[PDB]
Amino acid sequence: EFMGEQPIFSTRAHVFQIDPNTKKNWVPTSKHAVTVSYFYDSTRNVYRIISLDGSKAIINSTITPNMTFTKTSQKFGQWADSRANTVYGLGFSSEHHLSKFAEKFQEFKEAARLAKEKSKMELTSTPSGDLQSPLTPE
């Protein structure tokens, strides 16, 4: 498992990607199966898909409400990440794991929507040739 802050959900998959600025389509990111996890980053108040290959992150995708995870072939699903400017693809060990991951994606999509809503102003009546505003913005 992991040390320190635990992820909410983890699975095993081969990782693939599409880079917009190369002519190739799908390319293998990992040679072998790696752990793929949904993680709540409390300081940033966002949910992230985190995948490590050895000591480095090969997936660091911040879930947004408008993201779409699509199942497109046997045991394989994909989502586009506009922020990372990359499409990620996951090859699973069974159809069960593919579908479970997809279900979780929608769960984290809703949570991300609520997180953004939660991410407080004080309204007031108007303060009861001189200037009353601050001299500088900051």
Side-chain angles (χ1 to χ4, degrees), residues 1-2 4-22 24-30 33-65 67-99 101-105 107-109 111-112 115 119 121 123-137:
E1 33 163 345
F2 294 93
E5 298 190 36
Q6 287 304 309
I8 304 169
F9 178 88
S10 298
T11 182
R12 298 286 284 180
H14 282 75
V15 180
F16 297 85
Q17 67 187 72
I18 301 170
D19 306 310
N21 304 292
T22 57
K24 291 212 163 193
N25 293 310
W26 287 111
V27 286
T29 305
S30 60
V34 287
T35 305
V36 177
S37 298
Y38 293 93
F39 186 79
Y40 173 68
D41 187 328
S42 62
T43 54
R44 303 296 302 289
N45 182 220
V46 281
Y47 298 89
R48 283 173 183 173
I49 299 172
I50 300 300
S51 183
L52 308 173
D53 195 359
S55 58
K56 62 169 183 177
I58 54 168
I59 300 169
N60 182 349
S61 179
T62 303
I63 303 166
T64 57
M67 274 184 172
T68 305
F69 186 90
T70 309
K71 300 181 287 181
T72 44
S73 60
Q74 187 187 54
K75 295 185 275 194
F76 180 86
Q78 58 184 102
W79 75 101
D81 185 336
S82 298
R83 179 172 180 162
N85 284 310
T86 306
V87 184
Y88 298 103
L90 298 176
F92 296 87
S93 67
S94 67
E95 198 279 339
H96 177 260
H97 292 307
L98 169 62
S99 289
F101 191 86
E103 291 189 356
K104 288 293 171 184
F105 202 96
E107 190 181 347
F108 283 97
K109 278 175 62 178
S119 290
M121 296 290 292
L123 302 176
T124 178
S125 297
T126 302
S128 305
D130 296 336
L131 208 148
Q132 274 194 171
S133 301
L135 300 169
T136 179

